[PDB]
């Protein structure tokens, strides 16, 4: 507990007792798992007193201890970080980034990171205090690995968030620094940078173009094969987000030789990586016919069909999305190739699952295949849809019929349309 002597000494006038009491507060606040944050911040003027000590540029130890206590306070709930923010500490921490004491600089970086990572509200508060430029200047002139780690972590926190997202113009001046950071060897640095890039690349294609222009694609594709999962996972997220852009932006990643790496990742021992790789490939196959041809020539679709009929439902949903996108924008010959691999049966087997989204994707895929079957039957003049009999051999016709009683309107309206147009 905080003693009445502690409070009296914190507000004393002798720097010695001030430092001793601030150190006592910091040590109590650094206690886990239940720090006494509420008791401290509920003591009136104590947080204000720490923020006042932050301005004691003559005492390096008092500055450092007060900054550390405020960091511990900011490591709690949002309402406990609000007290640090409302005391006016963010502008002081951003000016302490240029302190002559390296300890104070690192502690201020850690505090601003904690504050920025509490919520999107605190993130935008810190950004609107003009932190990016001082932070980027400190990150380029750092002589401590731990300080660079903390600074990159705080930068990532400044870039994270989608509800709401940060104003891109306030976080995009950092994309040059992250591109250079991707060339380091520290796994923590690479991981935080990849997370920042994954969030900066999640959005409209203009943000993706900004990320591409920084020249990060080759390095991210290389990091896809990183041994440390904490680095490969965010890198795969970033690549998958990038391949959601137009066909040129996706072609950049494809030219970074990403399809072979994605193929290897499809055989990962972790279902999360397999799901994310399937999702990336589905974004790719949603592109033009050249990128679908690239996925074909990469020998990826056989593995996707295996996944479609053996993996977990979360991964099979993405594999089905990949196959269906391929059938949607592919040529008759490419879809003939997909059918020759035996995709109709694993797609029909998914019409009986509880996830209505998987059912809808499978239905759309079968619909595309049947549409091209009808077109080819027209060209032949025989009226023979060659792929109708294949859906019959899969015992999928009665599955489509059963889907007319589904609760989802999209599914049961799509099930009636198929039976009416193709199965007459």
Author numbering: 80 to 503
Paper text:
In the classical nuclear import pathway, importin alpha recognizes cargo exhibiting a nuclear localization signal, and this complex is transported through the nuclear pore complex by importin beta. IMPα proteins consist of three functional domains, an N-terminal IMPβ-binding (IBB) domain that mediates interaction with IMPβ, ten ARM domains that recognize and interact with cargo, and a C-terminal CAS domain (involving ARM 10) that mediates nuclear export and recycling. The Trp and Asn are absent in ARM repeats 5 and 6, resulting in the segregation of IMPα binding regions into major (ARM 2–4) and minor (ARM 6–8) sites.
Here, we present the first crystal structure of human importin alpha 7 lacking the IBB domain solved at 2.5 Å resolution. Here, we describe the first structure of IMPα7 NLS binding domain (ARMS 1–10) in the cargo-free state. The cargo binding domain (ARMS 1–10) of IMPα7ΔIBB was successfully cloned and expressed, and crystals diffracting at Australia National Synchrotron MX2 beamline to 2.5 Å were indexed in the space group P21 21 21 with unit cell parameters of a = 64.85, b = 75.84, c = 88.97. The structure was solved using molecular replacement in Phaser23 using chain A of PDB model 4UAD19. The final model of IMPα7ΔIBB consists of 424 residues (80–503) and 34 waters, with 79 helix-helix intramolecular interactions (analyzed in PDBSum). The structure is comprised of ten ARM domains, each consisting of three α-helices H1, H2 and H3 in a triangular arrangement, and overall forming a concave assembly. Structural alignment using Superpose in CCP4 revealed highly similar structures, with an r.m.s.d of 0.66 Å for IMPα7 mainchain residues of 80–503 (424 residues). Very little difference in structure was observed between the cargo-bound and free states, implying that importin alpha 7 does not undergo conformational change when binding cargo. We found that IMPα7 was most structurally similar to IMPα5, ranging in r.m.s.d values of 1.3–1.5 Å, whilst IMPα1 structures ranged from r.m.s.d values of 1.4–2.2 Å, and IMPα3 structures ranged from r.m.s.d values of 1.5–2.5 Å. We also found that comparing the unbound structure of IMPα1 with α7 revealed structural differences in the positioning at the major site (ARM 4) and ARMS 1, 9–10, whilst comparisons between unbound IMPα3 and α7 revealed structural differences at both the major and minor sites as well as ARM extremities.
